[PDB]
Structures are given as C-alpha cells and as structure tokens.
Design a protein around this ligand. Structure first.
Ligand SMILES: CCCCCCCC/C=C\CCCCCCCC(=O)OC[C@H](O)CO
Ligand SMILES: *C/C=C(C)/C=C/C=C(C)/C=C/C1=C(C)CCCC1(C)C
Ligand SMILES: CCCCCCCC/C=C\CCCCCCCC(=O)O
Ligand SMILES: CCCCCCCC/C=C\CCCCCCCC(=O)O
Ligand SMILES: CCCCCCCC/C=C\CCCCCCCC(=O)O
Ligand SMILES: CCCCCCCCCCCCCCCCCCCC
Ligand SMILES: CCCCCCCCCCCCCCCCCCCC
Ligand SMILES: CCCCCCCCCCCCCCCCCCCC
Ligand SMILES: CCCCCCCCCCCCCCCCCCCC
Ligand SMILES: CCCCCCCCCCCCCCCCCCCC
Ligand SMILES: CCCCCCCCCCCCCCCCCCCC
Ligand SMILES: CCCCCCCCCCCCCCCCCCCC
Ligand SMILES: CCCCCC
Ligand SMILES: CCCCCC
Ligand SMILES: CCCCCC
Ligand SMILES: CCCCCC
Ligand SMILES: [Ar]
Ligand SMILES: [Ar]
Ligand SMILES: [Ar]
Ligand SMILES: [Ar]
Ligand SMILES: [Ar]
Ligand SMILES: [Ar]
Ligand SMILES: [Ar]
Ligand SMILES: [Ar]
Ligand SMILES: [Ar]
Ligand SMILES: [Ar]
Ligand SMILES: [Ar]
Ligand SMILES: [Ar]
Ligand SMILES: [Ar]
Ligand SMILES: [Ar]
Ligand SMILES: [Ar]
Ligand SMILES: [Ar]
Ligand SMILES: [Ar]
Ligand SMILES: [Ar]
Ligand SMILES: [Ar]
Ligand SMILES: [Ar]
Ligand SMILES: [Ar]
Ligand SMILES: [Ar]
Ligand SMILES: [Ar]
Ligand SMILES: [Ar]
Ligand SMILES: [Ar]
Ligand SMILES: [Ar]
Ligand SMILES: [Ar]
Ligand SMILES: [Ar]
Ligand SMILES: [Ar]
Ligand SMILES: [Ar]
Ligand SMILES: [Ar]
Ligand SMILES: [Ar]
Ligand SMILES: [Ar]
Ligand SMILES: [Ar]
Ligand SMILES: [Ar]
Ligand SMILES: [Ar]
Ligand SMILES: [Ar]
Ligand SMILES: [Ar]
Ligand SMILES: [Ar]
Ligand SMILES: [Ar]
Ligand SMILES: [Ar]
Ligand SMILES: [Ar]
Ligand SMILES: [Ar]
Length: 228
C-alpha cells in the first residue's frame, strides 16, 4: 500500500483536508451569528468528509480492480463516495448565500447525484467505449449545474444586497473553473484513456479538491455576505 506511487498524494490530500477542516472550525469559534454559523458548519464538514475518504484510500480501503481495454485497472471508488456528499454541500453553500428556493435546491442536488453516480457507473464499466457514454451523461449533468449557478444564481444574487452579488460571483467563477477540470482529468487519467498514470491522476484531483473545498471555503468564510 505505502509503496503504490499515488500513496504520497493521498497522504498529502488527507493532511491538507484535515488542516482545512480544523482551520474553518477554529475560525468559526469567533462567530455567533446564526446565518454565519450555518456556512461555517457546511464549509468545515466538506473537507472533514474528504479527509476521511483520503485517509480511507491511503489505508487501502475504497479500491477495486475493473477489467477494460486489455488490463486490470485499479479504480478508487471512495473518491466518488466523497464527492457524492461534498459536492451537494458546496452547492448548498451557494444556495444559502443567494437564498435559493427549496425546489431549486432539490433540482441541483438531484443533478449532482446524477453527475457523481453516472461518474461512478462509468468508472466501473467493463466495456471501454460505454465508459465514455456515462462520462458524457455525467458531463451534461455538470453543465446543467453550472448553467443554473452561472445564469440563474447570478440573477438571484443581483436582486440581493451588493455584498452577496460580489461574493457570489467570485465563488461562481471559481466553481466553473475548478468543476470543469474534473471531467478532463477523468478522460486523461487511468479511469479514462490512460494518457497519464494513476499517481498523476491522483495528484491532479488532490489539487482540484483542495482548491474546490479549502480555497472555495476561504473565499466564502472571509466574506461579510455570510452575516445575517
Ligand atoms: C508525513 C507528515 C504528515 C503530518 C501531518 C501533520 C498535520 C496535519 C493535521 C491533520 C489534521 C487531522 C484532522 C482531520 C479532521 O477532519 O478531523 C476529522 C474530520 O472528520
Ligand atoms: C470536492 C470535490 C469537488 C468539487 C468535486 C467535483 C467533482 C466533479 C465536478 C466531477 C465530475 C465528473 C464528471 C463531469 C465526468 C466524469 C466523472 C466526474 C465525476 C469526475
Ligand atoms: C494526516 C494524515 C496523513 C497521513 C500520512 C501517514 C504518514 C506515515 C508515513 C509512513 C511511511 C513512511 C515511509 O515510507 O518511510
Ligand atoms: C496552502 C494550501 C493549504 C490547504 C490546506 C490547509 C490550509 C488551511 C488554512 C488556510 C489558511 C490561509 C492563511 C490564513 C492566515 C494567513 C494569511 O491569510 O496570510
Ligand atoms: C462563462 C461560463 C458559463 C458556464 C455555464 C454554462 C455551461 C455550459 C452550458 C450551456 C451553454 C449555455 C449558453 C449561454 C450563452 C450566454 C448567454 C448570456 O450570456 O446571456
Ligand atoms: C506513522 C505515523 C504518522 C502519523 C502522522 C499523523 C499526524 C498527526 C496529526 C494529529 C493532529
Ligand atoms: C476537524 C474535523 C471537524 C469536522 C467538521 C464538521 C463541521 C460541522 C458539521 C456540521 C454540523
Ligand atoms: C456511497 C456509495 C457506495 C458505492 C460503492 C461502489 C463499490 C464498487 C464495487 C463494489
Ligand atoms: C456496482 C455499481 C454501483 C454503482 C452505484 C451508483 C449510484 C450512486 C448513488 C448516486 C445518488 C444516490 C443518493
Ligand atoms: C467533447 C464533448 C462531445 C460529446 C460526445 C461524447 C462522446 C460519447 C462517447 C462515445 C463512445 C461510443 C459509445 C457507443 C454508443 C453511443 C450511444 C450514444
Ligand atoms: C465538452 C464540454 C464542453 C463545454 C464547455 C463549458 C464548460 C464551462 C467553461 C469552462 C471554463 C474553464 C474550464 C477549465 C478546465 C481546464 C482543465 C484542463
Ligand atoms: C515531482 C513532484 C513534485 C512535487 C511538488 C511538491 C508539491 C506539494 C504541494 C502541491 C500543492 C497541493 C495543494 C494545492 C492547493 C492549491 C489551492 C489551495 C487553496 C488554499
Ligand atoms: C473497502 C471496503 C469498504 C466497505
Ligand atoms: C447539456 C446541459 C446544459 C444546460 C442547458 C440549460
Ligand atoms: C483561493 C485562495 C483563497 C483566498 C481568499 C482571499
Ligand atoms: C477577491 C478574492 C479572489 C479569490 C480568487 C481565487
Ligand atoms: Ar506521510
Ligand atoms: Ar505527504
Ligand atoms: Ar503529508
Ligand atoms: Ar476544532
Ligand atoms: Ar465538527
Ligand atoms: Ar453541516
Ligand atoms: Ar466527516
Ligand atoms: Ar465520511
Ligand atoms: Ar470510509
Ligand atoms: Ar475506512
Ligand atoms: Ar472506503
Ligand atoms: Ar457515488
Ligand atoms: Ar460510492
Ligand atoms: Ar464510504
Ligand atoms: Ar463519504
Ligand atoms: Ar457523511
Ligand atoms: Ar459549488
Ligand atoms: Ar443545493
Ligand atoms: Ar436561485
Ligand atoms: Ar435548479
Ligand atoms: Ar427536485
Ligand atoms: Ar440543477
Ligand atoms: Ar434529490
Ligand atoms: Ar440533470
Ligand atoms: Ar448528491
Ligand atoms: Ar468521450
Ligand atoms: Ar464516467
Ligand atoms: Ar458556477
Ligand atoms: Ar476563476
Ligand atoms: Ar479557480
Ligand atoms: Ar483548474
Ligand atoms: Ar485554477
Ligand atoms: Ar467542462
Ligand atoms: Ar473544459
Ligand atoms: Ar469536459
Ligand atoms: Ar474520479
Ligand atoms: Ar483523452
Ligand atoms: Ar485517481
Ligand atoms: Ar490541477
Ligand atoms: Ar498539479
Ligand atoms: Ar487548481
Ligand atoms: Ar479557490
Ligand atoms: Ar475562514
């Protein structure tokens, strides 16, 4: 396990997620506003879940072998378990910031479930070509989410106080850039066409994940917009 080349990036991912979760909780000790406390709770829980799943993978859990394209391919399914919980919590941060209605929230959570679930089905698919049909459906669900965030949530944010619009657009921009990278990493890595080896795929997802959880969280929790 400790010899597998990806182990170094799983270990670092665990350390950075754990520290980010602790940082957000320590920062939240100085906060009593009820609205602000909801953002601190969501935003600390996200890297705490990722910490748990990075540690699981480092310790040899969350791994399966899938046959396709000639070979036995190691697939870390625990990555998809992390993202199944953490992606909707990050969307919930944005929904709470713009005061989205319950139906919009439901719709985003369902699309996010489609995105991550069809991702995992593709990752486990034993016929090389059908893997990419699942990837395309996953990617269309991502594009739907980003359309709702970029156009719908921006319109809602612009009807609110300027501090909300200002913070929402920065987070919106970060989300579009970072989320859009994931399907590309999947295509090039050991789960897709195998252009780069698993250790590089793991490093790329680790950087995206720390950016999309700790980076995103630092932007949100430093803002005045979270105070009611
Ligand atoms: C090799 C050297 C590596 C040393 C890592 C040292 C500090 C990182 C601290 C990680 C903090 C652990 C808290 C993780 C956390 O989220 O708490 C549980 C959740 O759930
Ligand atoms: C904390 C981690 C975050 C923000 C992770 C985001 C993950 C995605 C946007 C993943 C999307 C994928 C596709 C659109 C297609 C292929 C499979 C996925 C799941 C990697
Ligand atoms: C926070 C969690 C970080 C986890 C990392 C465990 C590090 C232990 C290193 C053991 C292997 C050392 C070696 O290969 O010489
Ligand atoms: C480097 C990337 C680290 C990601 C994982 C853990 C980081 C945790 C907290 C970030 C702290 C950011 C800086 C806080 C005070 C110092 C400053 O703002 O200049
Ligand atoms: C600039 C980033 C936009 C990201 C969100 C959209 C993701 C892709 C999904 C569907 C394409 C939508 C086309 C919208 C055209 C622009 C319309 C406008 O600016 O008013
Ligand atoms: C082998 C032992 C490595 C232990 C590293 C864990 C760091 C402890 C962090 C707690 C705060
Ligand atoms: C360090 C680990 C802390 C876990 C973070 C959880 C934040 C609040 C959870 C929601 C209630
Ligand atoms: C959280 C959902 C768990 C899905 C696990 C997938 C396991 C792959 C092969 C068994
Ligand atoms: C063995 C194949 C199992 C793949 C599981 C896919 C389902 C993931 C869950 C998505 C949303 C559910 C809540
Ligand atoms: C770059 C985005 C363009 C979208 C196309 C996605 C590619 C789909 C994967 C095709 C692999 C062959 C699958 C055969 C059955 C196709 C049925 C639909
Ligand atoms: C095939 C799907 C194409 C749709 C493009 C729309 C996605 C939103 C805009 C993307 C913005 C930057 C993307 C960064 C990813 C780079 C990773 C390499
Ligand atoms: C041969 C490989 C050389 C390894 C270089 C060492 C790199 C270690 C750190 C990589 C960066 C990991 C974290 C990046 C997150 C970026 C955004 C953080 C938001 C606060
Ligand atoms: C790896 C095993 C998780 C139930
Ligand atoms: C293919 C999904 C994009 C979203 C357009 C509303
Ligand atoms: C993405 C880095 C966070 C900085 C917040 C101003
Ligand atoms: C105003 C904060 C900018 C952060 C972008 C990474
Ligand atoms: Ar380590
Ligand atoms: Ar490490
Ligand atoms: Ar580490
Ligand atoms: Ar803490
Ligand atoms: Ar906690
Ligand atoms: Ar929470
Ligand atoms: Ar957790
Ligand atoms: Ar977890
Ligand atoms: Ar786990
Ligand atoms: Ar575990
Ligand atoms: Ar696991
Ligand atoms: Ar999943
Ligand atoms: Ar899963
Ligand atoms: Ar799990
Ligand atoms: Ar999880
Ligand atoms: Ar969870
Ligand atoms: Ar998000
Ligand atoms: Ar949401
Ligand atoms: Ar909205
Ligand atoms: Ar929606
Ligand atoms: Ar819904
Ligand atoms: Ar949606
Ligand atoms: Ar749902
Ligand atoms: Ar969807
Ligand atoms: Ar979900
Ligand atoms: Ar494809
Ligand atoms: Ar996929
Ligand atoms: Ar977005
Ligand atoms: Ar950005
Ligand atoms: Ar970004
Ligand atoms: Ar990126
Ligand atoms: Ar970036
Ligand atoms: Ar994309
Ligand atoms: Ar892209
Ligand atoms: Ar893509
Ligand atoms: Ar993945
Ligand atoms: Ar590729
Ligand atoms: Ar990976
Ligand atoms: Ar990256
Ligand atoms: Ar990287
Ligand atoms: Ar990044
Ligand atoms: Ar960020
Ligand atoms: Ar913070």
């Amino acid at each position: 396990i400790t010899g597998r080349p990806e182990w170094i990036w799983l270990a670092l991912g665990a350390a950075l997620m754990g520290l980010g979760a602790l940082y957000f909780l320590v920062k939240g000790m100085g906060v009593s506003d009820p609205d602000a406390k909801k953002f601190y709770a969501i935003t600390a829980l996200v890297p705490a879940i990722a910490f748990t799943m990075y540690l699981s993978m480092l310790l040899g859990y969350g791994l399966t072998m899938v046959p396709f394209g000639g070979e036995q391919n190691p697939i870390y399914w625990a990555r998809y378990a992390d993202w199944l919980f953490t992606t909707p919590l990050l969307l919930l941060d944005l929904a709470l910031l713009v005061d989205a209605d319950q139906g919009t929230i439901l719709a985003l959570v369902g699309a996010d479930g489609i995105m991550i679930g069809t991702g995992l089905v593709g990752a486990l698919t034993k016929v090389y070509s059908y893997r990419f049909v699942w990837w395309a459906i996953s990617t269309a669900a991502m594009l739907y989410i980003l359309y709702v965030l970029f156009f719908g949530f921006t319109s809602k944010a612009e009807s609110m106080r300027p501090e909300v619009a200002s913070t929402f657009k920065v987070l919106r921009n970060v989300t579009v850039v970072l989320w859009s990278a994931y399907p590309v990493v999947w295509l090039i890595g050991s789960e897709g066409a195998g252009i780069v080896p698993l250790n590089i795929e793991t490093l790329l997802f680790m950087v995206l994940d720390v950016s999309a959880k700790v980076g995103f969280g630092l932007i949100l929790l430093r803002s005045r917009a979270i105070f009611g």
